[PDB]
């Protein structure tokens, strides 16, 4: 069972309204645990998980200062790309970055990554070798050259293989009770009438952690690939997740359809039916 540390980083310009907004949001697995937001009354790195209480003010100071340096570097980037793309000074633009690492259950690095976008399109990315870059257009080629000349990938690789892995192990230890838990889904089926003697049956799964889950509708020991609708698994506001999946069946035939729920927290998968 692997784990990941990811940061989602965004810088968004806003001509006429002051400095760009700048935000860093960090996750261990699917759980938000830290956040920095330049628009806050008092912009600083803040805990978003209770177990992060285990870090002393030194940590918060160090991270905040890094974040403030990152903010400055991204303001510079926004300006740089504006020029390279020969774009008006009047429009808003966005830079995005995802940065982080994944480790195995033994705490060993599996993969590291860092990928940039501009205005929502691939810009530059670190390759799997952690040594070389892939640029997506001609402006990114300039950045690629700068970073080759400055040895940026070796710097990044040292963070991804060193710092990133080490902090992730420590977060997993400190938040063990929260991060390593399993919450079993609780499920139920709803029924909605339709025109033309057909019914919607909707299977809900609630209150689960971690986020990975599978819901299926079966007819005759067979899985339904069509007329089946669903939503992406989503957070429920308390650090648990939910999902639903529906199928449209002939009225009067409801009892022949079953919903199946597979989850880390279910030694045996759930089987449910519409209960009139």
């Amino acid at each position: 069972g692997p784990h990941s540390l990811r940061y989602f980083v965004t810088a968004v310009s806003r001509p006429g309204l002051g400095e760009p907004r700048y935000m860093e949001v960090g996750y261990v697995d699917d759980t938000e645990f830290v956040r920095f937001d330049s628009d806050a009354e008092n912009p600083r790195y803040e805990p978003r998980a209770r177990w992060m209480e285990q870090e002393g003010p030194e940590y918060w100071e160090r991270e905040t200062q890094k974040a403030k340096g990152n903010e400055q570097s991204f303001r510079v980037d926004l300006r740089t790309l504006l020029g390279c793309y020969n774009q008006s000074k009047g429009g808003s633009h966005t830079i995005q970055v995802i940065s982080g690492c994944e480790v195995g259950s033994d705490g060993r690095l599996l993969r590291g990554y860092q990928q940039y976008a501009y205005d929502g399109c691939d810009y530059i990315a670190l390759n799997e070798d952690l040594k070389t870059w892939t640029a997506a257009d001609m402006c990114a080629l300039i950045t690629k050259h700068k970073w080759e000349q400055a040895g940026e990938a070796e710097r990044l690789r040292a963070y991804l293989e060193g710092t990133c892995v080490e902090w992730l192990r420590r977060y997993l230890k400190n938040g063990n009770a929260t991060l390593l838990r399993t919450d079993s889904p609780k499920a139920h089926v709803t029924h909605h009438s339709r025109p033309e003697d057909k019914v919607t049956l909707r299977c809900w799964a609630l209150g689960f952690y971690p986020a990975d889950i599978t819901l299926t509708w079966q007819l005759n020991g067979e899985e339904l690939i069509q007329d089946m609708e669903l939503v992406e698994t989503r957070p429920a506001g308390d650090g648990t997740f939910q999902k639903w999946a529906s199928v449209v069946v002939p009225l009067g035939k409801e009892q022949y359809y079953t919903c199946h729920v597979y989850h880390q927290g279910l030694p045996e998968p759930l089987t449910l039916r519409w209960e009139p």
């Binding site: 940061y7 991270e63 974040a67 740089t80 940065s99 963070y159 710092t163 902090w167």
Partner: peptide
């Protein structure tokens, strides 16, 4: 802990 990013 977050990376200290380089300028582009």
């Amino acid at each position: 802990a977050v990376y200290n990013f380089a300028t582009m």
